[PDB]
């Protein structure tokens, strides 16, 4: 009926350890990085330290509620929620969470989680000081769940990029991938985010 | 009641996950940054490292109590109450909280949480060596709640600044913003603190 | 009694969130900074990185026990206690506490928590290389409790005996005076202890 | 069952602090490091900064379920599992896990925990600029459980540099995994460790 | 008993905050530092950054079990155990525990806690580049319990210069572990120490 009841009901029935696979078809996770800032770039070590928005979207029907005389959306801490086990495959630092750790939950079960991450990556810095800039690929996909459980998909440049960064974005491409691990035959999916940037001076 | 009863009552009944909106109105959150120190400034990267008191104030009627013969205010760990999910939109580091995680709650339900935060931002350092100084804009607002849920508003902000930093405050002006994105048909409010400072 | 029972009574009753106000009088907290080492002096930015034992003392009779054939003191984790919410107003880093966070509890309710803390401060470093040295002031006081709830008092009874013999610096004097602020919002008085650290390079 | 039922049963029955033996036989722990990136090398201090996936495998039959009309394997938080108390014996930094701390649990009781860990080590860095490269040995073994309780043996997958960053200053030449049985703490019992030798060199620009 | 039962009994009955004083006599805690690596040395500031194994042994009779048809030793998370409140008096940094925080408990009540700790200390670094080396003393003892509650002693039964990294930029010459008793001039009680004199030099 009210916000307190929904968050009470959500707290007590949300199964955070349980992926909401429905009729055993994959959970469609939509990940798009909104780049905000690029801090320290190294063309020698091929390392970048970047701040970006991880727009993450999925549906968890275990959260749904009747909206007749009730809020249309609530704000839920992700500790009381299932969050996809996303990992940046080429990160060389642990993701540093800048924002409060809440996701927005819609009454129909849609979940919107977008944390601020400061993280270091190993990618192609060659050409960052040149005219056409450097192209840095960041690969994000489920860490443990394969294609039958989590399906990751892009939304398809950033308008939220800080004008005061020493670097500037030229183009951002994010495409979907499908890989196979060298041990095990089922298929693990990732989204490929290509960051085209250069120095200003 | 005496303090033990109130703090028992607040701990066991507070819905820390629940926003205390009254009759579908937004929680009036009052943000004023009291700047304490600027430690590292870098004009090449346009980054500042700042220590400040993030004075935050709101009203939570679920915390109130009848204070006829009882204390007028208590001190509650912010884990046992709902705190607005504020986030500095232009920060490049996680807030380093230097003070205890306690809030002040008055008998009527007003809550005052003012932690000391050392945090790095990306803002305009250009002109920090000049006479008129550099002006660094910091935009602070709720990360998940929109305008009908949290309304942010400002309330002498250079009275506690360290007389020992290589930097000095010239002017501090605070305006509030309200943005509507092409995604979301709701309005998102933030307080933008423009910090005028220069080199010694 | 015995240690196992005493700590049971403290564990099961002591209200870590509740300040032990008695007859609505302020809780007299006694703060004395025992400086151990000065680790990073910077005269350009006026910043010091210092390690110190924060001798903090108050009385909490909700912990007391009749000390017949019983221990006169035990050792209690700070999670099972109310600890004053002291904060160095001029600190520029999080306090890094080096020792385990146990406090000493006397049978009458007196509590002693004296942790070793490494913390960086913004204070007066100018003159550290001259002979009489620079004096760096540290202001520590309760962050939420005002003058009627927590009263801070220096101990004016003692450093230069626990300071590291291997430090690049040497302590000249340590003086503690009391302060009281009234902030522009609320007609309360908020108390802090101002610890003056007179030190120089050797 | 379904995933929710399995994870309910596992969450509510896990004795995570209890090592999962049976017939008082040692737990078959299989550890093999897949190196992902070499970040900082220091030839003067003989210190290396490395990112690697620590593929760890053991069998815990208490997690098993009848898989008839049921999921084949699920994903369980390592907080709801016993994980071997493995430690890099020559480490000079705390292990930093970059990935979610989830393990993969199969209906037969098999567990797959493969975290991406960035850690600094003390090993022989001398020769990283030569052609044949430097050899960095990493000693991994249980910190408290001995050979009769935890036996470490490295695993089988494929290429030694199949997940190694092509953008690292360095390139892997060979990755060797050897098993040992020596003495830790004091004297009796047999204490096993896996010795992972990392052959790497600077890249030829 | 089986492994799960013993660890259950310890979890539910171990008094982690309660010191296990025996016959109202002090708890004999035995400290031995196994030096593993010397990382950063600074002769001007007199600071060393060290990785070492803190081998700790004590007896807690409340932890025991009849070892009949049951395991003779288990590994218990120190969250379910009493661990002495040891602190390095000469430390200038957080002790960085690198290993899992499990302790080994024998059916007789003896407990073994030996974590790998990376910590910085303030000691005499002068002479680290010379032939005889510097002597860096590290004093380890209980932080809140005094001598009649906790008695701290070295384990000299220690062979510690045996696990040191051959690849450290520095080399150990001597390690002495002696017993000390430090009394602060404020207060009459005395806190016992292990005094580790670490004689090492640069290569
Ligand atoms: C508050 O308490 C006083 C004292 O009992 C009572 O007279 C008064 O009606 C109360 N006010 C409320 C509940 O608003
Ligand atoms: C405390 O000491 C005695 C001895 O056990 C105890 O019986 C008594 O109740 C207490 N004495 C007083 C005066 O309260
Ligand atoms: C322990 O149990 C064994 C048999 O289970 C028995 O022989 C022995 O006496 C017991 N120890 C004690 C002290 O009762
Ligand atoms: C700036 C601040 N908050 C937001 C956005 C941008 C974009 C989306 C969004 C969705 C829910 C809550 N907040 C935001
Ligand atoms: C420093 C510390 N605490 C405070 C202030 C300054 C100012 C106002 C205030 C109001 C209530 C509680 N604490 C404080």
PDB file of C-alpha atoms in Angstrom, chain C residues 3-5 7-8 11 34 36-39 51 53 73-75 77 80 95-100 102-104 114-116 118 158 161-162 164-168, chain E residues 15-19 21 24 44-47 85-95 119-120 122-125 135 137 143-146 149 184-186 191:
ATOM      1  CA  UNK C   3      35.452 -12.312  34.119  1.00  0.00           C
ATOM      2  CA  UNK C   4      33.121 -14.603  32.149  1.00  0.00           C
ATOM      3  CA  UNK C   5      30.027 -13.420  34.042  1.00  0.00           C
ATOM      4  CA  UNK C   7      31.496  -9.575  30.396  1.00  0.00           C
ATOM      5  CA  UNK C   8      28.165 -11.386  30.011  1.00  0.00           C
ATOM      6  CA  UNK C  11      27.539  -7.718  26.673  1.00  0.00           C
ATOM      7  CA  UNK C  34      50.046  10.817  24.110  1.00  0.00           C
ATOM      8  CA  UNK C  36      54.302   8.684  19.887  1.00  0.00           C
ATOM      9  CA  UNK C  37      55.762   9.755  16.545  1.00  0.00           C
ATOM     10  CA  UNK C  38      55.626  12.537  13.967  1.00  0.00           C
ATOM     11  CA  UNK C  39      55.861  10.872  10.586  1.00  0.00           C
ATOM     12  CA  UNK C  51      50.831   8.777  15.621  1.00  0.00           C
ATOM     13  CA  UNK C  53      47.759   7.366  21.976  1.00  0.00           C
ATOM     14  CA  UNK C  73      38.877  -4.375  35.956  1.00  0.00           C
ATOM     15  CA  UNK C  74      38.195  -6.296  32.761  1.00  0.00           C
ATOM     16  CA  UNK C  75      38.843  -5.686  29.057  1.00  0.00           C
ATOM     17  CA  UNK C  77      35.446  -4.542  23.117  1.00  0.00           C
ATOM     18  CA  UNK C  80      29.798  -3.550  23.680  1.00  0.00           C
ATOM     19  CA  UNK C  95      41.956   8.054  12.076  1.00  0.00           C
ATOM     20  CA  UNK C  96      43.905   4.825  11.553  1.00  0.00           C
ATOM     21  CA  UNK C  97      43.728   3.006  14.888  1.00  0.00           C
ATOM     22  CA  UNK C  98      46.753   0.724  15.235  1.00  0.00           C
ATOM     23  CA  UNK C  99      45.847  -1.358  18.303  1.00  0.00           C
ATOM     24  CA  UNK C 100      42.887  -3.652  19.019  1.00  0.00           C
ATOM     25  CA  UNK C 102      39.324  -2.949  23.500  1.00  0.00           C
ATOM     26  CA  UNK C 103      38.579  -0.640  26.404  1.00  0.00           C
ATOM     27  CA  UNK C 104      39.449  -1.002  30.078  1.00  0.00           C
ATOM     28  CA  UNK C 114      43.476   4.623  24.782  1.00  0.00           C
ATOM     29  CA  UNK C 115      44.135   3.630  21.152  1.00  0.00           C
ATOM     30  CA  UNK C 116      47.202   4.247  19.013  1.00  0.00           C
ATOM     31  CA  UNK C 118      47.873   7.491  12.920  1.00  0.00           C
ATOM     32  CA  UNK C 158      51.691  14.542  32.788  1.00  0.00           C
ATOM     33  CA  UNK C 161      58.431  10.009  27.424  1.00  0.00           C
ATOM     34  CA  UNK C 162      56.450   7.933  24.913  1.00  0.00           C
ATOM     35  CA  UNK C 164      59.800   7.653  19.473  1.00  0.00           C
ATOM     36  CA  UNK C 165      63.546   7.947  20.057  1.00  0.00           C
ATOM     37  CA  UNK C 166      63.957   7.214  16.326  1.00  0.00           C
ATOM     38  CA  UNK C 167      61.755  10.043  15.012  1.00  0.00           C
ATOM     39  CA  UNK C 168      63.326  12.741  12.863  1.00  0.00           C
TER      40      UNK C 168
ATOM     41  CA  UNK E  15      33.795 -17.003  25.113  1.00  0.00           C
ATOM     42  CA  UNK E  16      35.665 -14.804  22.604  1.00  0.00           C
ATOM     43  CA  UNK E  17      35.645 -11.645  24.721  1.00  0.00           C
ATOM     44  CA  UNK E  18      36.429 -13.581  27.910  1.00  0.00           C
ATOM     45  CA  UNK E  19      40.075 -14.216  28.764  1.00  0.00           C
ATOM     46  CA  UNK E  21      42.582 -17.301  32.896  1.00  0.00           C
ATOM     47  CA  UNK E  24      43.221 -17.254  38.416  1.00  0.00           C
ATOM     48  CA  UNK E  44      66.542   9.027   7.509  1.00  0.00           C
ATOM     49  CA  UNK E  45      63.046   8.585   8.948  1.00  0.00           C
ATOM     50  CA  UNK E  46      64.027   5.334  10.728  1.00  0.00           C
ATOM     51  CA  UNK E  47      61.138   3.314   9.313  1.00  0.00           C
ATOM     52  CA  UNK E  85      44.906  -8.494  22.206  1.00  0.00           C
ATOM     53  CA  UNK E  86      48.475  -8.342  20.954  1.00  0.00           C
ATOM     54  CA  UNK E  87      49.777  -5.058  19.556  1.00  0.00           C
ATOM     55  CA  UNK E  88      53.219  -4.060  18.303  1.00  0.00           C
ATOM     56  CA  UNK E  89      54.197  -1.130  20.535  1.00  0.00           C
ATOM     57  CA  UNK E  90      56.545   0.188  17.819  1.00  0.00           C
ATOM     58  CA  UNK E  91      54.044  -0.009  14.955  1.00  0.00           C
ATOM     59  CA  UNK E  92      53.278   3.027  12.796  1.00  0.00           C
ATOM     60  CA  UNK E  93      50.767   1.378  10.426  1.00  0.00           C
ATOM     61  CA  UNK E  94      47.726  -0.870  10.323  1.00  0.00           C
ATOM     62  CA  UNK E  95      48.808  -4.518  10.541  1.00  0.00           C
ATOM     63  CA  UNK E 119      53.317  -3.634   9.040  1.00  0.00           C
ATOM     64  CA  UNK E 120      55.572  -0.584   9.331  1.00  0.00           C
ATOM     65  CA  UNK E 122      59.710   2.824  14.028  1.00  0.00           C
ATOM     66  CA  UNK E 123      63.082   1.322  14.942  1.00  0.00           C
ATOM     67  CA  UNK E 124      66.813   1.908  14.542  1.00  0.00           C
ATOM     68  CA  UNK E 125      67.494   1.669  10.806  1.00  0.00           C
ATOM     69  CA  UNK E 135      69.368  -3.526  14.660  1.00  0.00           C
ATOM     70  CA  UNK E 137      63.771  -3.921  17.595  1.00  0.00           C
ATOM     71  CA  UNK E 143      47.402  -3.911  24.534  1.00  0.00           C
ATOM     72  CA  UNK E 144      44.915  -3.854  27.448  1.00  0.00           C
ATOM     73  CA  UNK E 145      45.643  -6.883  29.659  1.00  0.00           C
ATOM     74  CA  UNK E 146      48.559  -6.410  32.052  1.00  0.00           C
ATOM     75  CA  UNK E 149      46.094 -11.302  33.068  1.00  0.00           C
ATOM     76  CA  UNK E 184      54.430   3.388  31.807  1.00  0.00           C
ATOM     77  CA  UNK E 185      55.273   6.070  34.381  1.00  0.00           C
ATOM     78  CA  UNK E 186      51.598   6.976  34.699  1.00  0.00           C
ATOM     79  CA  UNK E 191      52.760  -5.016  30.376  1.00  0.00           C
TER      80      UNK E 191
END
